[PDB]
Chain length 107, copies 4
Amino acid sequence: IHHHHHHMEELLDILREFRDSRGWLKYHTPKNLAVSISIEVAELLEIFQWTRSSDEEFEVLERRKGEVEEEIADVLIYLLFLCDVAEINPIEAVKRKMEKNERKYPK
Amino acid sequence: KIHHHHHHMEELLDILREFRDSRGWLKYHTPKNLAVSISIEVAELLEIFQWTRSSDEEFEVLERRKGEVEEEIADVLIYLLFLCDVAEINPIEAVKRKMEKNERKYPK
Amino acid sequence: KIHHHHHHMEELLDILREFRDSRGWLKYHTPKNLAVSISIEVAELLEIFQWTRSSDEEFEVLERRKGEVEEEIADVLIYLLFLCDVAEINPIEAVKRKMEKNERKYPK
Amino acid sequence: IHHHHHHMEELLDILREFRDSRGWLKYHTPKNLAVSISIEVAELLEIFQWTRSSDEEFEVLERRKGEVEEEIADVLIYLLFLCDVAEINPIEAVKRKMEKNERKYPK
Ligand SMILES: [Cl-]
Ligand SMILES: [Cl-]
Ligand SMILES: [Mg+2]
Ligand SMILES: [Mg+2]
Ligand SMILES: [Mg+2]
Ligand SMILES: [Mg+2]
Ligand code: NA
Ligand code: NA
């Protein structure tokens, strides 16, 4: 018995249900979703706004772990909504870019 | 009768980890630097649609420049997953938790 | 017969400098921290228009939420001017120089 | 003889001439300009992408002064184009926010 865990695919089903039960697909234009990603990554950055050292950055991370988790989740949700409307497979996207990176930055 | 689970996500992170550590780039992967790198890449994504003036037009641009859109999506996710690693955050769990919160804030 | 020049921009920066130094916040104003603060504020500005679906609609939102738009513009410019101070960059000169370059790249 | 230097007002005239000689006003929707600001501040941030200390940040600034200057200019140009279309006075905006800041963060 073989179980193929495709976690982003599974996440997308939870996402689609939410969006569609509310009728918010009509707002998910490519640029509105890209703008939504921009907004959430700014929320992530704000948590570390005024740190002055790599050392302090890890201290803020530990103390505000929950906030970091939420903004990472936010960035992801919108990236996945974007992948839905654009018909892009984000895992394959990552694999192809990493392959490109391997031949840009060789060992 | 034996169950065989395949962890495709852990497999993807392994490709990421291997790239990172073969190049000695871990030392650069502080929490803020990674968050800065995500911000940079989403702006690369935004740029593709910079001057569009209608929803209709964004889909024409998306169809026409799909490859560039795919690259920038990959760049965003790469650095997001790198951050997840340094922070020991499970981004699948984080999404599920956030959607559960979203359910309560925006009820049916 | 005497000429009396008024440096309104230098006056504005003085208000900024005075706020900063009365609070002992200079030590926080590193180049990257300021650039991070600008990124944060432009995203506050973007948020006002997050779900608009037409140019027509953006002007209705801009008219309706003009005060919020004004605040975020102020926030962006504040941190941009703080960066100019630490970097000793004259942003009026930088614009003029960049527009001169823009002239040559995009000729009439 | 009194000279009232209003430098952003003066910049805006150079900006308007450029935009209008090319017929690009039609692209300057509020959200396109906000998105353009987002793009340029990312260009600014990239210059410092991988620094690991406040010390290194000032070293990068000195070495890549020109690049920083250009991206600051870029951020400004779009903020001023935005102020044009929104009919906002950015100097007065700054003064009012600073006044608000003074009574939020008292001495
Ligand atoms: Cl997995
Ligand atoms: Cl002046
Ligand atoms: Mg959020
Ligand atoms: Mg990229
Ligand atoms: Mg603000
Ligand atoms: Mg630029
Ligand atoms: Na460490
Ligand atoms: Na210093």
